Amino acid sequence: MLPPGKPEIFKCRSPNKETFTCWWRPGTDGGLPTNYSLTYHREGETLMHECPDYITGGPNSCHFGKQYTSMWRTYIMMVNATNQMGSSFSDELYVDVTYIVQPDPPLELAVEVKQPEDRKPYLWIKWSPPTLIDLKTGWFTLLYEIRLKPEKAAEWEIHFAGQQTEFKILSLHPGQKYLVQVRCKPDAGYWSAWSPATFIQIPSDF
């Protein structure tokens, strides 16, 4: 017998400055919504549009593919909830895709112990950018961080790797086992999550 609570768009994100997704949540303290509609318009247009894809980002989400995504242009968007009893509109949300970029974490983290005669031996860390980001045209620019730690240590060692996809770590405790992770950020936006750990044994003779 109750119409819906006020819904809220609580997150928007873009993994690569070419598409983006937004998520909303229902207002508790109203009746069950049986439908939602996300509508938006862009800055300097008067056309009103509907969410182009309600499927791709799953539950309570709107996904904007390449043909609906552009940079340096604000989206003004609103979601409404409806059931048989009536309806309720969310607050307008202003979104500039440029500032909601958070990449997925980097891929293929590999680690190796390199022991050469002539110089100090070292740890050699290698990884790859996330799929889905265009670094090669210069459209996207990525920075990386590595962290590593042996189990039970209080603090992580952090090393900024810049734009490289490999790094050399010189000083480690022989015999100790390390967890290593890598994350990345764009030039403007948020750090990704850390990758899964790869584990490395530092041999005793190091």
Partner 1 sequence: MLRDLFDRAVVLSHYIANLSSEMFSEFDKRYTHGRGFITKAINSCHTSSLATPEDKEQAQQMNQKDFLSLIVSILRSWNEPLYHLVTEVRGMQEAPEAILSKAVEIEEQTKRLLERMELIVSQVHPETKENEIYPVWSGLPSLQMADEESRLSAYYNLLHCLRRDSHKIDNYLKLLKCRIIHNNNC
**Residues of this chain that bind partner 1 (CB under 8 A):** 17-18, 43-44, 66, 69-74, 76, 94, 96, 98, 134-139, 141, 187-188
From Na ion, Cl ion, partner 1, none, which one binds at residue 76 (CB under 5 to 8 Å depending on kind)? partner 1
Nearest to 198 by CA among 148, 144, 155: 148
Beta carbon of residue 24, minimum distance to Na ion (angstroms, whole number): 8
With contact defined as beta carbons under 8 Å apart, do 11 and 23 qualify?
Answer: yes
Beta carbon of residue 94, minimum distance to partner 1 (angstroms, whole number): 5
Among 8, 52, 54, 198, binds Na ion (CB under 5 A): 54
Binding of Cl ion at residue 99 (CB under 5 A)?
A: no
From partner 1, Na ion, Cl ion, none, which one binds at residue 91 (CB under 5 to 8 Å depending on kind)? none
Beta carbon of residue 182, minimum distance to partner 1 (angstroms, whole number): 20
The window from 34-42, 121-129, 133-141, 190-198 that contacts Cl ion (CB under 5 A) reads 190-198
Beta carbon of residue 104, minimum distance to partner 1 (angstroms, whole number): 18
* Distance (Å, whole) CA 121 – CA 124: 10
